[PDB]
Structure formats: structure tokens, C-alpha cells
Design a protein around this motif. Structure first.
Motif: not given
Lengths: 98, 49, 98
Positions: A43-45
Motif C-alpha cells: 500500500i505504501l510501495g
């Protein structure tokens, strides 16, 4: 019984009885299709990663997947609960002026 | 099918909302009693001045 | 008796009598058609899902499905109560100006 789980011939290494086939009908293996259904998206990558689980092992009688563009029979692994072949398509456009 | 029957056989009975919610996503919430094989297309256009 | 329910040869493992065919007429299997009649659509989710039940087993004498575009005989499984081949077609259009 033609159930490859661990390696190439790890489980089928010892064959005392006759090599009874699990499925008689001609069903082509899922080549480059949703067979690789595992994804490690961050989700952050960025975009999803490789598969985190085995997706080749199957339990029993082959569940037919008689669908697709051409006339060919695919397999659905026991890890994948569903495999739809809907060829949906859509598009949208917008414009404005100030 | 043997896969769904095994799921109903290996299924709790004390209102396990956790597994039931998990089992709900596996085979959907409700099945189709009658369908219609085929295909449809649509087009939508708008304009304002 | 040529009734594939459990496996390719699971039920037919022991065949002491002659392999009596259940149907003599040439009836082609339901290839890629509504045979996969199970769908698991989610009212909160998206498009219908795969089949949740076995749709290949049949009870007794083949029920003829002599219909379709070409001249070919299909089979209707015992799980599917009806299989119509109506080739309906319609379209609509509208316009307005303010």
C-alpha cells in the motif's frame, strides 16, 4: 495419482501401484494465465509482487474451466477459489472550457 | 461439488462470524437461480453549454 | 455405466459387467456453454463468480438438447433444470436538446 505438490517428482517418487490418472479428459494446464494468482502489493510501495503461496497443488478431481477466447480447457488450482474469464471493457472521456 | 461439501462438512456451528465472513467471500453471498448467457454494450454522452 | 460423478475412474474403478453405454445416440458434450451454470455474484461486490457446485454429474438417460445455431446435440446436466438457446436481440437509443 498425478498430484504434484512438492517438487517435480518429490511426492510421486515412490509409486507402488499403477499410475492411475486423476483426470482422463484433455485439459490444458493454465499457461501464463491467472495460475500465478498470488500478489504482494504494498500500500505504501508500488505494483504487486510475486506470489506468496503455492498455486499449483490441487486436491482431487479436476474442476473444469471450460471458458475463454478459444476452445480450450484450463485448470483451476485448489488454492484459487474462482477463475472468471469475463472480457469486460469500458472507457470514459470528459472535456471542459473556461 | 466435493470442494463445497467439504467446506460445509468442515464448518463450525456456534455462529463463527469470522470464518463465515471468510467463507462468504470464497463462494459469494448468494448464487444465481437463473442466468442469461450473452453480452451487452452501452454508450453514454453528455453535453452542457 | 459411464456416469462421471466422483472422478475419471473413481466410480468406475470396479467394472465387473460389460461397459454398457447409457446413451447410444451421438450427443456432443456441452462445450463451453451454460454447463458452468454456477455463479456467486456479490450484491456488494462485482460481476458473478465461478460455479460453487458440481455441474457435470447426470442421473439417467441423456436429455436431448437439439437446438442451437448449427446442427449438433448438446447435453443438459441433472443440476441444470433448463437450458434455452433463445437468440434474443434488442437495442435502444434516446436524444434530447435544451
Amino acid at each position: 495419482n498425478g498430484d504434484n505438490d512438492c517438487g517435480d517428482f518429490s511426492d510421486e517418487d515412490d509409486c507402488e501401484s499403477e499410475p492411475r490418472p486423476p483426470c482422463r479428459d484433455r485439459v490444458v494446464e493454465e499457461s501464463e494465465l491467472a495460475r500465478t494468482a498470488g500478489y504482494g502489493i504494498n500500500i505504501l510501495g508500488m505494483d504487486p509482487l510475486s506470489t506468496p503461496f503455492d498455486n499449483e497443488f490441487y486436491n482431487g478431481l479436476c474442476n473444469r474451466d471450460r471458458d475463454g477466447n478459444t476452445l480450450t480447457y484450463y485448470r483451476r488450482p485448489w488454492n484459487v477459489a474462482s477463475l472468471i474469464y469475463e472480457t469486460k471493457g469500458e472507457k470514459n472521456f470528459r472535456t471542459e472550457h473556461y | 461439488t466435493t470442494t463445497f461439501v467439504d467446506d460445509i462438512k468442515a464448518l463450525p456451528t456456534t455462529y463463527e462470524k469470522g470464518e463465515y465472513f471468510a467463507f462468504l467471500e470464497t463462494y459469494g453471498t448468494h448464487y444465481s437461480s437463473s442466468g442469461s448467457l450473452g453480452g451487452l454494450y452501452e454508450l453514454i454522452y453528455v453535453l452542457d453549454k
